[PDB]
């Protein structure tokens, strides 16, 4: 008995009949059992708060255009998902209870993969697993970049939320080129060179002419992406993954400051990772229950012990070199020299780490080989509770240390652990913190909800904001960036979606707001 906000059963019924006429009964889901899989969430709130009123699956641009026409006629708000694996950010459920889910998972054609110009053009339902298989079967000399969910996640969905990967092409939005969206009025708009008839540069040159709008659509509700292109890294002759293990929490300062110049000069070209002890442990499949059942956060003494028994450090750095054997050798000398001069850090090579975890899954992610090893993080405490708190930071040692201490303090206040890693770009850090809790425990769930709120508050007080967040907090995070920004975002919303049918609430953009 879930209906869209402000939509009567009568109007909803008319829209459903039209969706059926347009898409066919098998593509219109209104029964509770058909909707339950879309409702699965890891956020500290009951399923009902994000329950969809229905879901429709489209496979063509024309069907998507038909859907928005019906949505405008009956004021039906729709929440678009591609592969829908947005775990820790709301998964496949709508931002507001009652929205109809426009599920594009079946619109899964790989339109093109050019092995010479090195790019791909795909539909929303395409998964990285699907692309990996296609590239291997066809022996194409290119590689992918992807989030840990890799195999089951997809490039369109991940890029629309500006997700990240672990190869030199890890800044996904940065490597995206060309996008097609169906606007609320049904128009099909192509960014960049896509609007030029007969164009062959849609996946070649990003900007096009006049305002370049790809960014305006990411993390927004101004259109429905139906095609997206992106650049692919040519497969290099040599790939050399490596790890550097540090023993003290305080080393993060010197680690980051020594790493920055290496990233800045591109000597280490990929999005490096500096994983804390508990992230390392969770990724290696150790669970808290194996070391303690004491209430509250995991005692620093249990962590120091874990390090002692496993060899994991307070910080575990994973990076890689790419190129010809000669380029790799020259760069390896530079890297090893930096760490030797630092006087800290145990370097671990592939020959040494061998087939062990977590080195293996790290090396695979850094080379575009899919695996879901990191889902071990959800077994640290289990119960299905997980929210990503991901503040942005300068890639400066002191900043990273300050944020770690702040987060740790707030997490402990609520009986939770500091489970984190710094995803390193030349100048910035995606400081990723997995707020893990047992969602089957009501009391702990309330603590996780309050904890997330406090992390946002405390970080904002120090001038820090997150780059992406789950649906329960998208309005709260929008507040972090100021009223002028929100006002402009609502003016654009009014202009491209006067009826407020496209995922109202996405990033705090909703015409029902007083902006």
């Amino acid at each position: 008995a879930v209906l869209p906000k402000g939509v009567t059963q009568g109007e909803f019924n008319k829209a459903v009949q039209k969706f059926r006429a347009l898409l066919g009964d098998d593509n219109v889901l209104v029964e509770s059992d058909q909707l339950v899989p879309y409702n699965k969430i890891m956020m500290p709130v009951e399923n009902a708060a994000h329950a969809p009123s229905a879901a429709v699956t489209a496979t063509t641009v024309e069907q998507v255009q038909g859907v928005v026409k019906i949505c405008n006629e009956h004021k039906i708000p729709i929440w678009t998902i591609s592969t829908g694996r947005n775990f820790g950010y709301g998964s496949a459920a709508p931002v507001q209870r009652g929205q109809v889910i426009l599920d594009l998972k079946k619109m899964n054609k790989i339109i093109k993969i050019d092995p010479e110009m090195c790019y791909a053009l795909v539909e929303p339902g395409v998964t990285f697993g699907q692309m990996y298989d296609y590239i291997q079967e066809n022996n194409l000399p290119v590689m992918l970049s992807f989030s840990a969910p890799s195999a089951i996640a997809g490039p369109v969905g991940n890029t629309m939320d500006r997700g990240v990967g672990y190869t030199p092409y890890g800044e996904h939005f940065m490597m995206q080129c060309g996008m097609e969206v169906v606007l609320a009025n049904g128009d099909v708009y192509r960014t960049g060179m896509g609007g030029v008839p007969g164009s062959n540069t849609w996946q070649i040159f990003k900007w096009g002419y006049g305002p370049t709008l790809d960014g305006m659509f990411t993390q927004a509700n101004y259109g429905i992406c139906t095609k997206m292109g992106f650049w692919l890294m040519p497969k290099p002759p040599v790939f050399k993954p490596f790890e550097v293990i540090f023993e003290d929490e305080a080393d993060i300062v010197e680690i980051v400051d020594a790493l920055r110049p290496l990233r800045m000069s591109n000597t280490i070209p990929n999005s490096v990772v500096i994983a804390s002890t508990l992230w390392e442990a969770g990724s290696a499949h150790l669970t808290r229950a194996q070391y303690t059942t004491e209430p509250g956060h995991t005692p620093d003494s249990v962590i120091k012990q874990m390090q002692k028994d496993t060899g994991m450090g307070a910080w575990n750095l994973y990076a890689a070199l790419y190129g010809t054997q000669e380029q790799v050798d020259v760069n390896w000398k530079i890297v090893t020299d930096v760490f030797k001069k630092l006087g800290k850090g145990r370097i671990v090579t592939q020959e040494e780490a061998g087939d062990t975890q977590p080195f293996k899954y790290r090396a695979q992610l850094m080379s575009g080989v899919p695996n879901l090893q990191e889902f071990g993080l959800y077994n640290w405490r289990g119960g299905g509770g997980s929210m990503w708190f991901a503040p942005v930071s300068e890639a400066r040692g002191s900043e990273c240390k300050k944020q770690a201490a702040m987060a740790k303090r707030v997490l402990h206040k609520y009986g939770l652990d500091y489970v984190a890693e710094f995803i390193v770009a030349p100048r910035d850090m995606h400081h990723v913190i997995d707020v893990l809790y047992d969602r089957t425990n009501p009391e702990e769930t309330k603590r996780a909800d309050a904890c997330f709120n406090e992390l946002l508050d405390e970080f904002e007080k120090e001038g820090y904001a997150v780059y992406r967040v789950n649906t329960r907090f998208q309005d709260r995070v929008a507040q972090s960036y100021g009223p002028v920004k929100r006002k402009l975002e609502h003016a654009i919303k009014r202009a491209v979606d006067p009826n407020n049918i496209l995922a109202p609430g996405r990033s705090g953009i909703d015409l029902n707001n007083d902006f």
Binding site: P37, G84, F375, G384
Partner: protein
């Protein structure tokens, strides 16, 4: 078929977490798990395990993976 076979669905999706060598999820091979249970867990999701809509993994593929897994020897 959406996945062609139960073995292919297992290799491309389920196995990335459930194969013995991975260990993210419990071993399902040769566990005699009923098809109804597999569909239930997949559609509802289960704590740390995500749910998959029919658009991602349809009923027929679930029937196939259930039979495939049951046919395997227990690791």
């Amino acid at each position: 078929s959406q996945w062609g076979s139960g073995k292919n669905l297992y290799d491309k999706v389920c196995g990335h977490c459930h194969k013995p060598e991975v260990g993210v999820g419990p071993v399902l091979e040769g566990r005699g798990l009923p098809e109804a249970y597999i569909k239930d867990i997949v559609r509802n999701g289960f704590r740390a395990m995500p749910a998959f809509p029919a658009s991602y993994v349809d009923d027929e593929s679930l029937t196939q993976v259930a039979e495939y897994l049951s046919s395997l020897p227990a690791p």
